[PDB]
């Protein structure tokens, strides 16, 4: 019931999805892991508020059968509060440098201006990869499952309404009670990285038509691809999620700019997409990788 | 009603516990971590261990066995239990060498006991961390914990070792005859290659009437009715004990190396020649 170019347009973004979304984390190697003044007080004040929010338990299990479990410290006003901090930059990176590598491979992204294709990326990492994460994510377990590597969410003493007034875990439960297809994930990666109003975005135009090509393939993919009644408002179900993760997106970069400020754990990479210390010349790294 | 030779053993016996004995294991750093076959297979899964790593700040490292798939991940933790071992007995070393009665003995009979009880030693000194009700050696910042087996208790209870920890803590013994079972078993004139066997037997002799006499003054309830005579019936348990488990862990060792320099001293089978790092540790000081 799609235009084939509609019908194309899936298979570019589900072809550059699974060249470049290791959905085992087989490739995931070589991570850091925890070991075995008044208004600088206030800026500690709200950090700590940061981290509590979404904590994990770790899980690593071995070829051999074994399993190393971290169960992360409990807030004794120290630093103790950021100890996955430092594996949670590692993942983070071999994410984002993934998302790069699925932009890459659309045709459509590809064929912007430099300045463009980075400022878009630095806009939507947060969103895509929360996106990937919502797959590998069990909400039977709230584990993301994410190969031998597991996270599970710990009980914080409320409970699961506990949790949900985290608008992170709320977003990753509700999108997982839609049970999207593949082709539905896909499209709103693409929906999320080609939007328009992302800071720096010159050809504001050109990125807003190709966004609304991947809604309306998206919107018509629902309507001749599910029980046209019961689904009737499953893409606006999917739209206003997807903005929703805009607005958690500006909330945990502005709580990562916090906890960076007292206590650095931004790798290179993550620093150039924070803004931490032209737009070339401030994401040399992201440059880069964009240009191979 | 001890006699005050008597009371002076017990108060230089406890004051070498505490001089020597890390009970927090707080100094125990550095230690590797997990990352004829049919004989071993049964012998360690007996007693199989949960490792638990409690941090200062707060966090819990928790590692789970591999369940025996018939393979090497049999010896999975024994790299790690050669460097606890080790530890251990550096202390049970260092315990031995403030002993007057011990450091007075030849060189070559210091290192000739301490190769016969380093075992048994280590063991009596596990006990006192060990949690019967948890099944659980709670070695300070580490924990060791059994995992469950088929029949529980019962067929765990097969494994000698294990049936030696939960009866030596069902007598609840005090620390004086902790320490005081400790000596007995350092001051052992049979053990192989000691040359002054009626001095260390006249050694052994006072140190076990001591505790006698310890438990005479002391403990007057029905259930420490014959407690010296229970007592001494275990130190020579566990000498038997200490034979199955240091020829189980020769066997060990020729298909899978694990023990430390130390330990191959140990087991190795001029005495301080062949006993090179056991020589340096006497001679250095505390
Ligand atoms: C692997 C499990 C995923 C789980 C799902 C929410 O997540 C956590 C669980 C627990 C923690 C935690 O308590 O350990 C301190 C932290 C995170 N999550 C990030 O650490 C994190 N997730 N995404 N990003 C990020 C990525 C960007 O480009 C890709 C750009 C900005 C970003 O953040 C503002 C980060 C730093
Ligand atoms: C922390 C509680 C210790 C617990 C109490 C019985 O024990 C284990 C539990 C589990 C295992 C295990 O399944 O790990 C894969 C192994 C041991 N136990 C030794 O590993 C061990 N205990 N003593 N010694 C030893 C020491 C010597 O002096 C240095 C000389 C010879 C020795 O052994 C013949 C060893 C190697």
Redesign the pocket.
């Not at 929010?53 to 994990?56: D, H």
């Not at 950021?82 to 901090?85: D, E, H, K, M, P």
């Given at each position: 019931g799609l235009t084939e170019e509609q019908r194309m347009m899936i298979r570019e973004l589900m072809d550059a999805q699974m060249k470049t979304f290791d959905t085992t984390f087989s490739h995931f190697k070589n991570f850091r892991l925890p070991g075995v003044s008044r208004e600088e007080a206030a800026k500690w004040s709200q950090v700590r508020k940061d981290?509590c929010?979404?904590?994990?338990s770790l899980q690593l299990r071995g070829e051999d059968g074994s399993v190393w479990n971290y169960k992360?410290p409990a807030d004794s006003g120290g630093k103790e509060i950021?100890?996955?901090?430092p594996?949670?930059?590692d993942?983070?990176?071999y994410?984002?440098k993934g998302?790069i590598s699925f932009a890459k491979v659309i045709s459509y992204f590809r064929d912007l201006p430099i300045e463009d294709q980075i400022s878009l990326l630095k806009g939507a990492?947060?969103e895509?990869?929360?996106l990937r994460?919502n797959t590998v994510?069990n909400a039977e377990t709230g584990t993301?499952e994410?190969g031998r590597?597991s996270?599970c969410?710990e009980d914080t003493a409320g409970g699961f309404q506990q949790l949900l007034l985290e608008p992170?875990?709320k977003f990753?439960y509700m999108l997982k009670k839609l049970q999207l297809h593949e082709e539905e994930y896909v499209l709103m990666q693409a929906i999320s990285l080609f939007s328009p109003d992302r800071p720096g975005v010159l050809q504001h135009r050109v990125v807003d038509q190709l966004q609304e090509q991947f809604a309306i393939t998206l919107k018509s993919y629902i309507e001749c691809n599910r029980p046209q009644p019961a689904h009737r408002f499953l893409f606006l179900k999917i739209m206003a999620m997807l903005t929703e993760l805009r607005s958690i997106?500006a909330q945990?970069?502005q709580?990562?700019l916090r906890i960076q400020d007292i206590h650095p754990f931004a790798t290179p990479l993550?620093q150039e997409?924070?803004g931490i210390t032209s737009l070339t010349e401030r994401h040399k790294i992201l440059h880069r990788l964009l240009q191979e």
């Open positions: 981290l929010s979404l904590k994990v992360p950021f100890s996955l901090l594996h949670m930059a993942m983070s990176t994410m984002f998302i990492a947060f895509l990869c929360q994460f994510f993301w994410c590597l996270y969410l992170m875990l990753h997106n945990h970069t709580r990562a993550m997409l924070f």
